[PDB]
Amino acid sequence: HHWGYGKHNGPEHWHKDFPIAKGERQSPVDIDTHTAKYDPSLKPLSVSYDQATSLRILNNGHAFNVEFDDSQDKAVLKGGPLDGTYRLIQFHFHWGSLDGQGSEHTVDKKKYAAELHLVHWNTKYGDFGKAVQQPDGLAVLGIFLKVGSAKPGLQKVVDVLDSIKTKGKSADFTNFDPRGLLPESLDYWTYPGSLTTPPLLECVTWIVLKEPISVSSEQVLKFRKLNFNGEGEPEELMVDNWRPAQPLKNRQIKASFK
Numbered sequence: 184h185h186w187g188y189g190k191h192n193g194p195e196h197w198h199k200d201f202p203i204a205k206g207e208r209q210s211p212v213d214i215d216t217h218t219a220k221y222d223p224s225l226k227p228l229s230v231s232y233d234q235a236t237s238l239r240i241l242n243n244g245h246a247f248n249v250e251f252d253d254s255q256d257k258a259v260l261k262g263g264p265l266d267g268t269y270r271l272i273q274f275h276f277h278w279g280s281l282d283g284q285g286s287e288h289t290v291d292k293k294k295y296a297a298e299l300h301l302v303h304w305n306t307k308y309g310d311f312g313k314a315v316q317q318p319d320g321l322a323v324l325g326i327f328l329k330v331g332s333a334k335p336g337l338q339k340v341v342d343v344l345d346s347i348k349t350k351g352k353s354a355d356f357t358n359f360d361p362r363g364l365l366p367e368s369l370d371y372w373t374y375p376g377s378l379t380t381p382p383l384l385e386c387v388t389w390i391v392l393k394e395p396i397s398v399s400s401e402q403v404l405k406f407r408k409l410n411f412n413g414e415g416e417p418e419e420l421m422v423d424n425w426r427p428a429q430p431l432k433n434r435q436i437k438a439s440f441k
């Protein structure tokens with residue numbers, strides 16, 4: 184059936200329709216700090232978001248995304264473990280019903296309140312569709328959110344959620360600066376993985392930042408007020424839209440710092 188996060192169509196059922204679910208490079212995984220390999224040959228991250236053009240915010244029934252104009256090298260990511268330029272196409276969050284759960288990746292088994300995913304695709308492939316067929320087609324920057332003080336740069340997103348309550352609704356969302364969601368440090372962990380939602384394709388290089396950002400209870404509280412359902416259907420609150428950590432198998436998590 185159309186996949187979801189419920190008892191009957193959740194992550195433990197995805198394998199029936201998406202065999203790749205039991206593959207060798209599935210995400211997310213648990214980050215074991217004592218086992219991660221510090222690699223000094225890794226380069227520093229290069230994030231150029233000064234010419235970014237946000238366009239729209241939409242509730243797709245699984246989460247809400249903020250889409251950006253990716254027809255040109257306007258907001259890119261390079262460096263780190265990547266080769267080539269990757270264009271930002273959208274960012275979304277994964278969160279929980281309670282502050283002690285919500286993130287997809289865990290560090291030493293610890294779950295954060297939420298996780299931000301800035302999705303980028305390798306420009307050498309032409310368009311997003313082609314990149315999802317290549318082993319190095321996508322690069323997602325993952326940022327953990329912990330409950331604390333308000334994040335000013337996130338406030339514009341919070342204000343507009345009201346108009347995109349149910350599945351299928353969208354609102355114009357121009358002039359948003361994604362630079363306001365980055366932590367101070369760009370130190371990160373990296374490993375080969377996959378999308379965390381169906382089709383679960385193994386086309387991703389994961390870059391998870393070491394330093395989380397702080398957002399207030401009221402800020403995260405407004406995420407929980409979104410709906411999985413569409414207008415007119417019975418109401419299911421949008422919470423716990425996250426996949427459990429998958430076995431590492433034979434992969435190595437590397438780190439840019441020591």
Ligand SMILES: NS(=O)(=O)c1cc(F)cc(F)c1
Binds near residue numbers: 300380
């Ligand atoms: N969750 S995720 O970041 O791996 C992801 C990225 C994407 F571009 C599309 C998806 F459906 C899911």
Ligand SMILES: [Hg+2]
Binds near residue numbers: 316318319320384385
């Ligand atoms: Hg792929």
Ligand SMILES: [Zn+2]
Binds near residue numbers: 275277
């Ligand atoms: Zn995601």
